Design a protein around this ligand. Structure first.
Ligand code: HEA
Ligand code: HEA
Ligand SMILES: CCCCC/C=C\C/C=C/C/C=C\C/C=C\CCCC(=O)O[C@H](COC(=O)CCCCCCCCCCCCCCCCC)COP(=O)(O)OCCN
Ligand SMILES: CCCCCC/C=C\CCCCCCCCCC(=O)O[C@H](COC(=O)CCCCCCCCCCCCCCC)COP(=O)(O)OC[C@@H](O)CO
Ligand SMILES: CCCCCCCCCCO[C@@H]1O[C@H](CO)[C@@H](O[C@H]2O[C@H](CO)[C@@H](O)[C@H](O)[C@H]2O)[C@H](O)[C@H]1O
Ligand code: CUA
Ligand SMILES: [O-][O-]
Ligand SMILES: [Cu+2]
Ligand SMILES: [Mg+2]
Ligand code: NA
Ligand SMILES: [Zn+2]
Lengths: 79, 73, 43, 227, 144, 84, 259, 49, 46, 98, 514, 105, 58
């Protein structure tokens, strides 16, 4: 519901050339959503919008490094 | 003989300065018109005439048939 | 400005010697290095 | 790309680059006119044996020589800042591509749908095919759809680099830890070249950028075949 | 006459058209005939000879304004010597070409440039003004 | 502010000695009581090898290269965790 | 014989020995960072100390013993010291700008927060607050020492100046103990970088200011200052107030607003 | 009393000009420098593919 | 005191113009040659 | 509260500092700390320029607020005039070692 | 006696002479490095090696020209010789500290040449940005030796700024207000306030670089939460004031030379000239991020730095129109120094105007990091600061030495250098507009005609530097001693004779109030 | 400021002062040649009569050359001014620079 | 302590032609030679260390 996704849309929260926090925020939102959904016995499909937007915006090495550090227990953001 | 007439004797530097600063001003307006036509307008008219009937698929098909692209044979 | 005539005048021939020695002092050592670049590069 | 003996900008491939060309013509005429006027006055001040060497009153003439330059700087700044804001305007891109600078090559990621990424290195001079351009061709070009608004996001995995394509009016630094965004929209198909624009060590001169702009259907098939 | 370094704090003589009457006479010491000439200048000047008048001028001043304002031929020596040393510079560039620089890349061979120029026309490099705009694609020749 | 104080005729040696013994050294004795009362070791947090801490891009020019200059074994873990 | 009031200084070797000490300190730090050796550095630190001692000794010989600091020479030395302190204020502005840049826009690697994840700041209400009462108190006692010297009272000047130095040494011992107790280090990312380089260069300035006050204490013990002429004490006091004001900015910015 | 310029000015001007032109024309044209002029009006394009 | 006057207020002698030419040649020529010898030194390492 | 023991300048200044301090008390200015005040500068009332030797440089600020100062040597002997405004100055040489 | 005079000096004229000798030697180092850049670029391909050796030569070329040639000659050489004489003072305020500002420079230059001798040099650009200049991409001692060379030159110049400001404020005749001091003394006073406030922020930035390289701090390393762009703000907070420090003493020597050789007693518009130098010094601290328009700053920031940088053209135009008004009506003397000053008025105006083009950030996205920036700054440095240094050197060489140059040789030297510099840099505007990047040891083939012309111009500029050395030898070899100098009533530095005695103004000037 | 006539009247006054001294004669001429004008014949006549009261024939010739110099490329001005002063030149026996051969370079 | 500044004023004003840095007596010359020797010695050693560091140590 709201597919035909092409790429991440303009986000008034992040209107400038530096888009580092956009990528970050969406990776956090995705993983937060996903932890909420896996817990309360719900569906990760509802987290999809964040997953698409972070995958669009974030460099593959940044997501790779953040996933390694969540596995390792050294990811410094709150999830 | 005839005597000589009294010439202007005062303000000769200032009078020269005024005459040529005006001259430079007239020349500067002349170059600005010239340049508006030879350069600025020329360029606006080159881009508008290029695009007026430009067919980007036609231009792509010519480049493709000439072999230039990696993604289109 | 005004000045006295030279106390030790440097004639045209003396100027050509000083100019030639000054030019050679800059050109010969750099010329030697640049002429031998290849010797240094593939060595 | 630049051609031999070129004097000015590469022809514009994007509407913003055309705007920059007409804004530079405006500014260059002013630059020409003031350096000419200064050279001319110099010549005028030096070509008379008339003299006036007593104290000269400065206040009147200093009004002219502060207000006429202030008015010229306003005449430069107004179209300058209109272009600055037009480039920044919101535009709804159709596609996002990332580029990461490395010593000494660029990688590209197109991850809106599938995980597509690759490296793009300069073709060495000894391997150029006949007719190809020394120091500018790469093995894997950045294929993109023509006539479409694209968001390019630029970063680095090592030292600074800078990702430039002069004929699209683009130069965005590639800084590790930072994701900078720019917009690209080519009005035409073709091949559009640029070169790394921040000193990055031994092969800074030898890590170029080649965009290949083609119709969307060809970009979509190319992207599928690069997975 | 003779100006000495140890006179630097004294009023001095200068010829410059903007300072016509300098602070001291050109000659201050007078011989017997010169003294008599300065006494004769106290009487009517119509009784001085042209020579005596010139001599009084040249005791007071060194050069006349025509002499101090004269042009010279020094521009010929400056321009000629500057062309010489600019010409000497080309010797240095001929030596560098011969001994320093190796062959340039193969991409400047005639056949490579002819093919490179066809490919630049095929990709319509600078098609609005700069490069392919100067080729006639209908006639297959450079625009005249 | 005039502060809560009062004095001024001239600001002389007698007044600045009154300020040193009647305000500034009592403030230092009060802050010394306060500090030397919340002292005593609070207990060290679990070690987590976060990559933005314990940076080592070049060995230090002293010691074994891996200890900071005023390394305290009780509270400063190495990149591999607390010392034995 | 001159007829102006300025000081023509005798030809001196200390500018050259001070320049060579700078070459030996910096080439010394490079041998220590890259060639595993402290030898050039301790030669440079030793010759820098010897130069500083003989140059300032000779300024005391020129002024207290030979009379060359007329009022116009002393007014020059006032401007010199004010301009010197302005240059040191702008050196610390660079380190404040680094700290605000890093803390106002904390990057993802820190957790996107300040203080970073994993950092546990000192409590600004414990030894940092005690250090702030100590350096404020020392600005009050060095003001008492200044007015005692202007009122000609040798015992009280020395009493107040000694109390000022005692508090400078108390701050430096307290700061050395908090460096050792602190659970983060200079290698703990940009929080430890900003905290130890900015408080560390401030601690260096407190040790330089306290040494300058100890020079004035011994000069006063030797009767060098008169009740109207004592620019070395005025300069040390202006320097000491600068060290106090830098600490107040460091305590508000890095220990309290940045915790 | 002619000075150096009066006596040698014409020869320095004529000799230096002659020399400078001859040696820059020789350098520009005779030693293999590649000026890389525009191909426009100069180069016959050739099949490359 | 120290010598005063033209040719005396300088740390090099101008008493003999040819010994001065040698000294000026050594002085300017060593600053101009040093970068070429540095380059040579960097090329001869690897 | 208070007590003594700090020397005064009267007691302990020496050298040039003491010379300046003792001349000031006399209202004298042998080390040129103050600007001299101009006379009317006529030939009957020239500005009197003290010197220890036979000539001293004068700077004349011809009118208040001029930014150009006119500099020349004034020699012992008959008064000289500023070459810009003509105001007169006369050298008064000698001694300073009391 | 020779060691006492020349190694233990406390005299402002001998310390000025030491600075002029050091700056002249550094100019020959800087000229050789410039010829190595243009030999690498004078035909397509590779001459010396890849970009690391090339950019070690570019980085050293800049540091030697700026910190070891222009600053020591303008501020240490002309400032020390001229400023005390132009205010009648008997020396600098701190004559012994002045000698340490000089003697810190040979060790700073030794550190710079050591940085190029060790490992593979510091191939970083004179801006020394990380992470290329950090310990992973430039491991080993070269970049730390460059840091410490800039720390020594920084302390020399901060100590020297304290000395000049104190001497100009405190040591004028008591009747002389600062609105009766000559323009060159104002230009050195304002340059020294810019050095005092800007060099400490460079010293903080480069010490942070030193600790990220050696103490495991992470001010500029994102892995620790640092930011490479914070180093660029700290360096350019100094680096924009630095270019005004390079040109302001030149503007003060151009005002004296144009006044003198126009036969005028004063420059046109003295209070305007003082206002324009203080306005340029103030505006020069609020514009630094015009060196960062492609780093990804917010749009409103980039609009502010475009506007605030363009504003500088207003005071600078007042100075250029006031130098033209000073020539107006003059009895013009076509001396070699006047030729250098009239070259400077026009060529500095051209370079300043291409600086205004670059201040428009939209256009600077396509011009940044290309040779259009290299053409702008060499018109204001090789044809601006250096033409003011050559004008001031041939105008004041007979004051410093007591001997005259040959004017015909000096005119020949000006004509050769004017052709060479223009040949070198004018075509770099075309290379910049058509996209050639900075810091490249080789270029795509289309850029070959203008790189060949620009390297031919650099060789003509080398012929002028060699001929300048022979001209200085011919003047000391011939010994034509000065007699009378014109206009001493408005040029106090000549009134003590040529050269002036070791001690001058031992009896101060007499200046009354009235 | 003032009219032309007022300016000329003050400079004729300055040079007509009977006891003008040599310094004032030089100060007057060297100041008057700073202005953007060639001085009127009436100013020149009073300066030449000051030279005669100061027994200085040579400075009278130099003031005639300064008039020619101030006129720059306006070659009509000097012959006019010499015409106007022919009766003072004949009365005082002042030869012009051309009659003395001093216009030869 | 007693005020002995007048004794030091007499010492440092003796008309003996000594520059100030040597005017205290034989101490000052020993401390000057120490400092100068360490400076010049240490500078020669820094130049030796640059020679060593300018070549690879394999
Ligand atoms: C002496 C050296 C010097 C001087 C004085 C200046 C002066 C100026 N500079 Fe320049 N500049 C450099 C040296 C200098 N520059 C250097 C070294 C760099 C490169 C740094 C690096 O990256 O290594 C550079 C880089 C640089 C940039 C960054 C470009 C980029 O990297 O992409 C910009 C941007 O705005 C700039 C602008 C200006 C301007 C507006 C001035 C103004 O001060 C000029 C003002 C002068 C005038 C305008 C001319 C006279 C005025 C008139 C006749 C009046 C009428 C004029 C108008 C109405 C316009 N300079
Ligand atoms: C004062 C500064 C200055 C000066 C004068 C010059 C002068 C020259 N420079 Fe420049 N240059 C820079 C500062 C300067 N440069 C800077 C800051 C950079 C950027 C570095 C970076 O990218 O990091 C640079 C970069 C630079 C490049 C771009 C390199 C690249 O991007 O890859 C080029 C290219 O041709 C170049 C060439 C030259 C040449 C041929 C000259 C010639 O004009 C030189 C000719 C010689 C002289 C001007 C004589 C010098 C002086 C004297 C001998 C003193 C005489 C002594 C007395 C009178 C007392 N320089
Ligand atoms: C107690 C308060 C007083 C501080 C003094 C103490 C010791 C060393 C002196 C340094 C003074 C100032 C700043 C220099 C940089 C860093 C030191 C910062 C202060 C400090 O001492 O930081 C310590 C680290 O020292 C380290 O790395 C130290 C490594 C020591 C080497 C220093 C390197 C030299 C730097 C060059 C400075 C250049 C100056 C340029 C001037 C500019 C010119 C105009 C902190 O210890 P830690 O174990 O990491 O953490 C505590 C964990 N329990
Ligand atoms: C680990 C520590 C080592 C590192 C280096 C520094 C170490 C400690 C140095 C402490 C500074 C001591 C300064 C002593 C100065 C003594 C001389 C002096 O004080 O001299 C006075 C003049 O002031 C003068 O020059 C004023 C002079 C001085 C400025 C001193 C300030 C600091 C300099 C510090 C270097 C800072 C480093 C910054 C690092 C980034 C003499 O004039 P009066 O006092 O009026 O006397 C005359 C009366 O007697 C007449 O009746
Ligand atoms: C950028 C600044 C430099 C610009 C150019 C300098 C112009 C160079 C001047 C000449 O330099 C000399 O050139 C000789 C060649 O002409 C070199 O001899 C070399 O070649 C000779 C001829 O092959 C052999 O006889 C010699 O042994 C061999 O050293 C010689 O070493 C070098 O000093
Ligand atoms: Cu990558 Cu330059
Ligand atoms: O810096 O312009
Ligand atoms: Cu700038
Ligand atoms: Mg850049
Ligand atoms: Na090359
Ligand atoms: Zn006057």
């Amino acid at each position: 519901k709201i597919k035909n996704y092409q790429t991440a849309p303009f986000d008034s929260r992040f209107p400038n050339q530096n888009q580092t926090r956009n990528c970050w925020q969406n990776y956090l939102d995705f993983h937060r959503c996903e932890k909420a959904m896996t817990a309360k016995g719900g569906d990760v499909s509802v987290c999809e919008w964040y997953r698409r937007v972070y995958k669009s915006l974030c460099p593959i090495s940044w997501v790779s490094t953040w996933d390694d550090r969540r596995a390792e227990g050294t990811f410094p953001g709150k999830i | 003989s005839t005597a000589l007439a009294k010439p202007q004797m005062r303000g000769l530097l200032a009078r020269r300065l005024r005459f040529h600063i005006v001259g430079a001003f007239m020349v500067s307006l002349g170059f600005a018109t010239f340049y508006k036509f030879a350069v600025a307008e020329k360029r606006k008219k080159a881009y508008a005439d290029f695009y007026r009937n430009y067919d980007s698929m036609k231009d792509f098909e010519e480049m493709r048939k000439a072999g230039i692209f990696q993604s289109a044979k | 400005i005004t000045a006295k005539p030279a106390k030790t005048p440097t004639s045209p021939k003396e100027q050509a010697i000083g100019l030639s020695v000054t030019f050679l002092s800059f050109l010969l050592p750099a010329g030697w290095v640049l002429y031998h670049l290849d010797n240094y590069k593939k060595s | 790309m630049a051609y031999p003996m070129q004097l000015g900008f590469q022809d514009a491939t994007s509407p913003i680059m055309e705007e920059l060309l007409h804004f530079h013509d405006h500014t260059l005429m002013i630059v020409f006119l003031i350096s000419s006027l200064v050279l001319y006055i110099i010549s005028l001040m030096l070509t008379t044996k008339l003299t006036h060497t007593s104290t000269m009153d400065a206040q009147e003439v200093e009004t002219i020589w502060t207000i006429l330059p202030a008015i010229i700087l306003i005449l430069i700044a107004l179209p300058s800042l209109r272009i600055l804001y037009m480039m920044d305007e919101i535009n709804n891109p159709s596609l996002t591509v990332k580029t990461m600078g490395h010593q000494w090559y660029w990688s590209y990621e197109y991850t809106d749908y599938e995980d597509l990424s690759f490296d793009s290195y300069m073709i060495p001079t000894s391997e150029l095919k006949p007719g190809e351009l020394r120091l500018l061709e790469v093995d894997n070009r950045v294929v993109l759809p023509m006539e479409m608004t694209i968001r390019m996001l630029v970063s680095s995995e090592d030292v600074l680099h800078s990702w430039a394509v002069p004929s699209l009016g683009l130069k965005t630094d590639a800084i590790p830890g930072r994701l900078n965004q720019t917009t690209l929209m080519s009005s035409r198909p073709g091949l559009y070249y640029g070169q790394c624009s921040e000193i990055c060590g031994s092969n800074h001169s030898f890590m170029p950028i080649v965009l290949e702009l083609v119709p969307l259907k060809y970009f979509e098939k190319w992207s599928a075949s690069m997975l | 006459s003779v100006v000495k370094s140890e006179d630097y704090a004294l009023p001095s003589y200068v010829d410059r058209r903007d300072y016509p009457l300098p602070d001291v006479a050109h000659v201050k010491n007078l011989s017997a005939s010169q003294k008599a000439l300065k006494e004769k200048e106290k009487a009517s000047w119509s009784s001085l000879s042209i020579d005596e008048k010139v001599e009084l001028y040249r005791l007071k001043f060194k050069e006349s304004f025509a002499e101090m304002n004269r042009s010279t031929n020094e521009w010929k020596t400056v321009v000629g010597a500057a062309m010489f040393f600019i010409g000497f510079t080309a010797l240095l560039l001929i030596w560098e070409k011969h001994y320093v620089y190796g062959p340039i890349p193969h991409t400047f061979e005639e056949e490579w440039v002819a093919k490179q120029t066809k490919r630049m026309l095929d990709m319509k490099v600078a098609p609005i003004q700069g490069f392919s705009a100067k080729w006639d694609y209908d006639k297959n020749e450079w625009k005249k | 502010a005039s502060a809560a104080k009062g004095d001024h005729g001239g600001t002389g040696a007698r007044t600045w000695r009154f300020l040193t013994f009647g305000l500034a050294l009592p403030s230092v004795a009060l802050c010394t009581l306060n500090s030397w009362l919340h002292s005593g070791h609070r207990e060290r947090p679990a070690f987590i090898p976060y990559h933005h801490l314990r940076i080592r891009t070049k060995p230090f020019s002293w010691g074994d290269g891996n200890h900071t200059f005023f390394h305290n074994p009780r509270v400063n873990p190495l990149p591999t965790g607390y010392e034995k | 014989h001159q007829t102006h009031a300025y000081h023509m200084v005798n030809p001196s070797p200390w500018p050259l020995t001070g320049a060579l000490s700078a070459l030996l300190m910096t080439s010394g730090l490079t041998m220590w960072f890259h060639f595993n050796s402290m030898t050039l550095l301790m030669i440079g630190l030793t010759t820098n100390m010897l130069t500083m001692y003989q140059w300032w000794r000779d300024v005391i010989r020129e002024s207290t013993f030979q009379g060359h600091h007329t009022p116009a020479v002393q007014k020059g030395l006032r401007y010199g010291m004010i301009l010197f302190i302005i240059s040191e204020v702008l050196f610390f502005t660079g380190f404040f700008w680094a700290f605000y840049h890093s803390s106002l826009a904390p990057t993802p690697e820190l957790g996107g927060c300040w203080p970073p994840t994993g950092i546990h700041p000192l409590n600004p209400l414990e030894v940092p607050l005690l250090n702030t009462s100590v350096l404020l108190a020392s600005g009050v006692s060095i003001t008492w020492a200044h007015h005692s010297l202007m009122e000609g009272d040798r015992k009280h000047m020395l009493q107040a100046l000694f109390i000022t130095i005692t508090l400078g040494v108390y701050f430096t011992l307290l700061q050395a103990s908090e460096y050792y107790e602190a659970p983060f280090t200079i290698s703990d990312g940009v929080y430890g970088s900003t905290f130890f380089v900015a408080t560390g260069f401030h601690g260096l300035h407190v040790i330089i200011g306290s040494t300058f006050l100890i020079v004035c204490f011994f000069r006063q013990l030797k009767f060098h200052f008169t009740s109207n002429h004592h620019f070395g004490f005025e300069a040390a006091a202006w320097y000491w107030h600068f060290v106090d004001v830098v600490w107040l900015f460091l305590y508000v910015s890095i220990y309290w607003w940045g915790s | 009393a002619p000075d150096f310029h009066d006596k040698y000015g014409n020869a320095v001007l004529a000799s230096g000009a002659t020399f400078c032109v001859a040696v820059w024309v020789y350098m520009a044209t005779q030693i293999g420098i590649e000026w890389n002029p525009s191909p426009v009006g100069r180069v016959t394009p050739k099949e490359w593919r | 005191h120290y010598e005063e006057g033209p040719g005396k207020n300088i740390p090099f002698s101008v008493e003999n113009k040819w010994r001065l030419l040698a000294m000026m040649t050594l002085f300017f020529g060593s600053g101009f040659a040093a970068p070429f010898f540095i380059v040579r030194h960097q090329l001869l390492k690897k | 509260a208070s007590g003594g023991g700090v020397p005064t300048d009267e007691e302990q200044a020496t050298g040039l500092e003491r010379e300046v301090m003792l001349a000031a008390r006399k209202g004298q200015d042998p080390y040129n700390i103050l600007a001299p005040k101009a006379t009317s500068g006529t030939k009957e009332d020239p500005n009197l320029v003290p010197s220890i030797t036979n000539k001293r440089i004068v700077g004349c600020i011809c009118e208040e607020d001029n930014s150009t100062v006119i500099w020349f040597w004034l020699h012992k002997g008959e008064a000289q005039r500023c070459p810009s405004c003509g105001t007169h100055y006369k050298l008064v040489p000698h001694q300073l070692a009391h | 006696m020779f060691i006492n005079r020349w190694l233990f000096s406390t005299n402002h004229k001998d310390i000025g002479t030491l600075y002029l000798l050091f700056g002249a030697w550094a100019g020959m180092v800087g000229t050789a490095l410039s010829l190595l850049i243009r030999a690498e670029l004078g035909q397509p391909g590779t001459l010396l090696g890849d970009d690391q050796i090339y950019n070690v030569v570019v980085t050293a070329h800049a540091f030697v020209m700026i910190f070891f040639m222009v600053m020591p000659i303008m501020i240490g050489g002309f400032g020390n010789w001229l400023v005390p004489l132009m205010i009648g003072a008997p020396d600098m305020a701190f004559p012994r500290m002045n000698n340490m500002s000089f003697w810190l420079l040979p060790p700073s230059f030794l550190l710079l040449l050591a940085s190029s001798m060790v490992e593979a040099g510091a191939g970083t650009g004179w801006t020394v940005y990380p992470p290329l200049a950090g310990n992973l991409a430039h491991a080993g001692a070269s970049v730390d030796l460059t840091i410490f060379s800039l720390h020594l030159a920084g302390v020399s110049s901060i100590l020297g700024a304290i000395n000049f400001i104190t001497t100009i404020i405190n040591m004028k005749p008591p009747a002389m207000s600062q609105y009766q001091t000559p323009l060159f003394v104002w230009s050195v006073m304002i340059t020294a306030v810019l050095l005092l406030l800007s060099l400490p922020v460079l010293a903080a930035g480069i010490t942070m670089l030193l600790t990220d390289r050696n103490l495991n701090t992470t001010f500029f390393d994102p892995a620790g939460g640092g930011d490479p762009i914070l180093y660029q703000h700290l360096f350019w907070f100094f680096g924009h004031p630095e270019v005004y420090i390079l040109i302001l003493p030149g503007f003060g020597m151009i005002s004296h030379i144009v006044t003198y050789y126009s036969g005028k007693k004063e420059p046109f518009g003295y209070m305007g000239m003082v206002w324009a130098m203080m306005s340029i010094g103030f505006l020069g601290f609020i514009v630094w991020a015009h060196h960062m328009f492609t780093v990804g700053m917010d749009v409103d920031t980039r609009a502010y730095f475009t506007s605030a940088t363009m504003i500088i053209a207003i005071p600078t135009g007042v100075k250029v129109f006031s130098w033209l008004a000073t020539l107006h009506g003059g009895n013009i003397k076509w001396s070699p120094a006047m030729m250098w000053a009239l070259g400077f008025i026009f060529l500095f105006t051209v370079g300043g105007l291409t600086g205004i083009v670059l201040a428009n950030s939209s256009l600077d996205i396509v011009l940044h990091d290309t040779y259009y920036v290299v053409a702008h700054f060499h018109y204001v440095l090789s044809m601006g600061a250096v033409f003011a240094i050559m004008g001031g050197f041939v105008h004041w060489f007979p004051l410093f030495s007591g001997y005259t140059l040959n004017d015909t040789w000096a005119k020949i030297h000006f004509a050769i250098m004017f052709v060479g510099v223009n040949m070198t840099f004018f075509p770099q505007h075309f290379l910049g507009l058509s996209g050639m990047p900075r810091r490249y040891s080789d270029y795509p083939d289309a850029y070959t005609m203008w790189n060949t012309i620009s390297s031919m111009g650099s060789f003509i500029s080398l012929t002028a530097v060699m001929l300048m050395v022979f001209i200085i030898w011919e003047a000391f070899a011939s010994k034509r001693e000065v007699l009378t100098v014109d206009l001493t009533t408005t040029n106090l530095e000549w009134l003590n004779g040529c050269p002036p005695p070791y001690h001058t103004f031992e009896e101060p000037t007499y200046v009354n109030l009235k | 400021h003032e009219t032309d006539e007022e300016f000329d009247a003050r400079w004729v006054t300055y040079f007509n002062k009977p006891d003008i001294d040599a310094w004032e004669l030089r100060k007057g001429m060297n100041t008057l040649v700073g202005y953007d004008l060639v001085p009127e014949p009436k100013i020149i006549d009073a300066a030449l009569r000051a030279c005669r009261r100061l027994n200085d024939f040579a400075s009278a010739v130099r003031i005639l050359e300064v008039v020619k110099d101030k006129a720059g490329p306006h070659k009509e001005i000097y012959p006019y001014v010499i015409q106007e002063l022919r009766p003072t030149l004949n009365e005082l026996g002042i030869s012009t620079p051309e009659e003395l051969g001093l216009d030869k370079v | 302590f007693e005020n002995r500044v007048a004794e030091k004023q007499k010492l440092f004003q003796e008309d003996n032609g000594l520059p100030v840095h040597l005017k205290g007596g034989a101490t000052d010359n020993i401390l000057y030679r120490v400092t100068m020797t360490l400076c010049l010695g240490g500078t020669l050693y820094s130049l030796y260390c640059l020679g060593w560091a300018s070549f690879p140590h394999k």
